Design a protein around this nucleic acid. Sequence first.
RNA 1: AUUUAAAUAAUAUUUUAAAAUUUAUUGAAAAAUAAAUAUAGUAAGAUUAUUUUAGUAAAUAUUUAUUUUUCUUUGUA
Lengths: 76, 111, 187, 137, 45, 345, 55, 103, 54, 366, 22, 127
Amino acid sequence: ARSPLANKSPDEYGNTWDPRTGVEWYHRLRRRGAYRHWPWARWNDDPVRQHQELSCRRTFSAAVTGANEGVPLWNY
Amino acid sequence: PRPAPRFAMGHMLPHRSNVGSQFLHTQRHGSRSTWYKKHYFSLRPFAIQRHHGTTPRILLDRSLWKSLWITKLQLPDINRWERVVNSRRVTEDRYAFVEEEGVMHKVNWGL
Amino acid sequence: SGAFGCGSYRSVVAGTQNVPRRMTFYPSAYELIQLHKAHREVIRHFYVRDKIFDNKFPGNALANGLFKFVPNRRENYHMRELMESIRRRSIWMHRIKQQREINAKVVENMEVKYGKKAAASMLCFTTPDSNAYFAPHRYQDVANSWPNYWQHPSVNHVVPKPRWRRHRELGGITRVEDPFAVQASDY
Amino acid sequence: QHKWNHWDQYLNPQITQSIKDLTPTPEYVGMRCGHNMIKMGWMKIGGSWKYSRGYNDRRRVRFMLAPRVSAGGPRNRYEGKLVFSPLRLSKLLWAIDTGRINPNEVITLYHLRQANVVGEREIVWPGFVLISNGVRR
Amino acid sequence: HYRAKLELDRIRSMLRGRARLERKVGLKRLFFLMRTQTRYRVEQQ
Amino acid sequence: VTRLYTSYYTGVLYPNQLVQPKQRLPADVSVSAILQKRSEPRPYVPLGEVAKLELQGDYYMEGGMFQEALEHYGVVAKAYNYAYPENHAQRIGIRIKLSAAFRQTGRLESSLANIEEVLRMLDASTRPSLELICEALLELGITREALGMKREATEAYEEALEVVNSFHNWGESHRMLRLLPRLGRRFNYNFEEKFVYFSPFDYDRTFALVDQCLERAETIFNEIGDVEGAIRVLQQRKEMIDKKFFNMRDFAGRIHTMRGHWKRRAQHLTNAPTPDELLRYSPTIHQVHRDFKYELTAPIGREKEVMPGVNRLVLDMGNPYRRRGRLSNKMLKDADHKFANYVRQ
Amino acid sequence: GFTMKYKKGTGLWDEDHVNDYKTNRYLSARATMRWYQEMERHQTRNSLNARRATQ
Amino acid sequence: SRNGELCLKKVIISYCPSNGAPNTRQFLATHLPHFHAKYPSVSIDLRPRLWPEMAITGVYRDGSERSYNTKNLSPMGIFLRLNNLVSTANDYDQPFCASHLHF
Amino acid sequence: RIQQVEGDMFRFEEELLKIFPTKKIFVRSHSIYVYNVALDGRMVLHHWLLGLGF
Amino acid sequence: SSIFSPRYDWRTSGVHDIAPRDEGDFLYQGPQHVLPGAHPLPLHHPHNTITRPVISPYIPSPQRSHPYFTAPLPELPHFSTTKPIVYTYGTMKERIIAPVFNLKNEVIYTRELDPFIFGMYPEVEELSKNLTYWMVRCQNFASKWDYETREIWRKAKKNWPNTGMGMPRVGNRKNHLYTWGGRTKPSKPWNMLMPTMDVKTWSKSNRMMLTLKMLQGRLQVVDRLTLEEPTQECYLELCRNMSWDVRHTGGGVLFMDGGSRITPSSEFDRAFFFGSFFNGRNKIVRPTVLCDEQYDYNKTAAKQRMKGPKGAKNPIPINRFNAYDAMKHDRLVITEGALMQLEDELYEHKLQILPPHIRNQLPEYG
Amino acid sequence: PKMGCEEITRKARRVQLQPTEY
Amino acid sequence: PFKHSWEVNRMLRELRLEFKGQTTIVPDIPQVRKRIWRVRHIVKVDVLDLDEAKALIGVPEHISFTDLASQLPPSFGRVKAVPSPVIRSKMNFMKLRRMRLRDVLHRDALELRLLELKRSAMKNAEQ
RNA sequence: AUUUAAAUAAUAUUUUAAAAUUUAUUGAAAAAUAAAUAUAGUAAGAUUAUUUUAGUAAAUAUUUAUUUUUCUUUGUA
């Protein structure tokens, strides 16, 4: 119905400020015709690194090859 | 090239149900589906055959084809019995079965 | 019009150059079949146009000399059905005769450039499996093409050999001596 | 009692003795035996008709929100519209290499029809288009 | 619909007059009797 | 809903649970007889507990500790030995197992002697279990091959296969299992009722035994260096397996979902002729004896063998048109005469 | 109307391209005769009529 | 089966040798001999007739008749009804109740 | 639907098992059915048959 | 009743009289006792080789692929097939050679059958399509007529006004409810279907029926079907000499008359065909397994005074060869003329079937 | 429609083969 | 459980309890406790430390439960939790199919080996 | 015009009922007679065959589909 409890896990009942009600919200939980593959952006895609490891193995001398390693990608 | 409808093979003329087809041939209005069935408890007549559909190859005298049970015509002699033997019409003597020595004996039906 | 191998009238008006085409050796097998069943057909037409009454029952015996076709229909059948069919068979014959003219030339050129053996084996159509369609007893150990696959000599061992014997007193009947297997009836 | 199924008569044709063995494809169940009743299953004959209302009514027998386009209509035939039945170069080449047709002789629509590479139901005026589908040479 | 006419018809000899005579009445009596005893046997006795 | 089967659940009743009989050696044949063809070229015992003791025994054996299986089998063998009469099947069975236990421990002559007792017992039996003779001489085979005689071992295995080929019915195990796929009326769910399968290595132990027999045999041949032997034996093993597979065959019934003819299972589960016994007993080879004293119709020359009766008048052929008017009976007048000269003598 | 007259006598024998819906599985000895006579009577009467008509 | 003697005496099997409905003939071929070898005491009598009653029938030692209808019943079923005939004395049918458990 | 197969059809089925382990398969005298397999499946099948020497 | 219903198992007594018949009945002796009729397979017709005799060299067996001569035997003249032989899809892949019988019943020369015709291995679904086609086609459709509500002849008026009565609500009682009435959707020939057959299926199914006859050893090849006189008893003479059984009750004969090897005819041999009318079980058919393409000139409704059925207006004529009559008559007798006609009319058919890489070798192979 | 019927003994109308849709 | 809301029923389901009277054994890890906490007005609970449990069934002390679990077959009844009854269907299906392929691959292995012996035999005999 | 399938056949569609309408005859200073298949989920009433084998736009029903990861659990399309 229009009940606050629609399409929510019982843990998430607590949040009133975002009701999940509505038809298409029901259609993207049970994943139905438009939404058959839902979230169109999920984890396991990154637009940034394309899932490849940024490092420089291209060091001039092959001696020092791992010289730049664990240069942090963010604060961690 | 759709196979011939199997229900229409003629072996079957049910009595006009809810479900059916345009090509299913059911029986006439007001005529029952099994001929000996005049009531629901009505028995299968014993040695009396009713030839139906095709013309019969051998037609006994005591049976029915395009006919009614006319008794003077159907069994001319009552003391006699009719049967098909070696592809001919043949007439034996009607016997009755009677328990005698603990076995069952054949005796002349008439007398 | 077209329908011979040359070209239609509208290709002559056009002025396309088809004249020195490359010749290749075409066995024309498909058209031989079509020819066969065209010729088979012309004769049919000739037969049915010429049907005349022979009536085996006395009432219908008053018509016994006549053609079965009313003359006006008989003639029409001769124009439309029949002698068109002859034109069809005719066209097939043309298309085949043409290519024998060509195949002769191909065979000559190849025979010169190679020599009789090489050429002959080049123009042979034999596929490795051709035995399966033609003389199957030579294809047997290759693969099993039988509809009954259990009687083929490779899988043959599966079917049982019964021990059997005739019986006089049972009327010359042959009868199998093998003891039956006791069956599972219950649970 | 066992009726001979299709596997048994294949194995041993000796036991196909009568017309009653000749039963059709096993995927024929029988005649339609019941009522397919909307929103309730397949009901049974002489069952409950309580749930047949929609059924009985079905048994007796928006585009104005969308504008018109092109007073003829979008794909519309008219007399003398050229709609060609497609003929794929793939099909033609295959016919040549398979041996339906002569590479030696100029190919008309006639030769295509005689060799059966195109059935009659495909032929309509104007006759045919030649497309190149997946044929790079 | 199947009211089990054919089996219960054989029992009708256990009823007194009006039901034992006329087939329909007897069948109603027997259908009622058996259904009642079934219900009792499962949920009560 | 879905079942967790958390509480106790009574199993289902299903056709594979049929009680299958033990195929037997025919009455007249003797095992020592075929072995000479080979050399040519009741008192109360608490059987529940001793059985318990025995099963614990081959749990020990299967688990790889053989001495204990030996002790256990020892007890059980003493018990059965006391409980059953001479040469009874259960006796020879358990001392087969005892032989196997000895062999594994390193008491070799013990195993040998015991397995010979098994054999000369089997010979002296009425109609031994066909599985038991097989198991027995597989054992004798292994023990022989551990002793260091490879030729003889090979011979034992080969004679297992040459028993099972003549005296064993290949198609019997699956007679009831064959058509079971036809049961399931659901397609898009519960459709493993259509694909139901039962491994021949289970529903009959005989084929599994002879199979492992020939496997062992072929190994031995590969060690001796004998090629023709290895090929003979492998081919035999194959032919055995597909004898077995061929009897499981059938064509699909209705594929897609069928709603409710539930009384049709009466057709699907029956005694269906096994492909084996459909080819074996086909009515042209094994004929139906058909006697005419019980029948009303014979062939032409045999016509007086028909079931007799009191005074008979042959009236006519039964021609149905004799019921119509005079002109119809004017035809068919000469019919009967002509039909009497057809059948004379 | 249009019955396909052009197929009428066309067949190899007399009995075909004849619409016949009145028949049985088993045709007796004389029902068969009646059938063979029916057929050639059908052909004969139709041909003879068309002769009489146009003459 | 009381104190060593089967209560069943005759079994009456009627069948037609040539006509149709094979089930009984099949039975006579495969399943009957096993029954005969297992219960020797019982006299089995076969009644060939043109129109066979498709019932199997037993006869007991108190002169009690019992029958089972076999019409288009598979041979396995027939064998089973036989083994039902042997296993009953045909003396009584009481219900199975608490009151009736001790006879 | 695989039709023109002629021989022991079941051995055919049993290779067809290894090609499509997951799908559902049925045999009938004339033909072999493979369910839930589209044109892709037809492509594999034709590769296997071409490469098998047919 | 049905096996499941409690009605089954009624008649717990009385079905037999307990007393044997003192004539026919007997006790079961033991396992060594041969019972009349008893067989391990579910045979509906338990015919042995005495009751329904077979003519072929061998009694059909699982060991023999087919019951005829596999290679031409040195003591008889051997005639090869009229047209050369190609092995197509469903064909036996083996040599099939059948002996030819004279009319004095001794064997004369041996003749080879064509595996595309007599070798097409039978499978039941096709034979089904054939058989049901036949049994539906062969009804009398003119007798399927019935009365309709508008055909009844009463007055059209409300027969009593419905207001205050306890009577039913009725007008125009010519409905189906009433004893004198007739249905809304009655039966009548023009609404009954006559099935279309496709020439492919008729060809294949017939050929499988022939092959089925051949695998049973019920096939017999003859020089000519000919009589001395047109009379019946000359025909019955013939039938007695060849041990053909034409009695109604015995397994009959199905004649394909083609004329002889040298002089094949489409037409029936007059003398034979005339005497061939005999009350017993026998039939004479045309020598073709093909059929004309079937057509419909009302495929919609168009011609309304059509009596007819709906369907093919061109049903297969009755004297043709089919599954029904091949099943009902056991011995199938074919004249060599008919062999030749079959082979010839089927030839280009069987050729058009072959895969193209085979077809190309056809002219090269002759 | 019954033999003795006065209804069908006097002929009323006879229904044709009804025409089908476009 | 039909007396209670659907949340409490999803919990009772994850505790693997269908009806009244059923009994289960579950681990003590935090998730399980989160479940038992919500159904605690239905369920009654009892605790065993793994020593007490190793005693309750005679289990030699030196044998942990990790290896006991590593031994027993995954094929044990109602093997998995799968998402819908169709998937369950085809899981059982696949199980059977694996059997067929086991025996088929057995036969085919045989034919391969035999083909090898015949090839080496023909090659060594001709040569 | 870069670019994959295919079993070419249609003819059928519950059942009983108004007050009505319409056409054509007869009669009297609208009635009767004769012809039709008008319409009736808020007028209605009937609709023929037990022993069963998966649940409750959105829902339900029919046929059919996906082995998408964690301690267990799950009908999603």
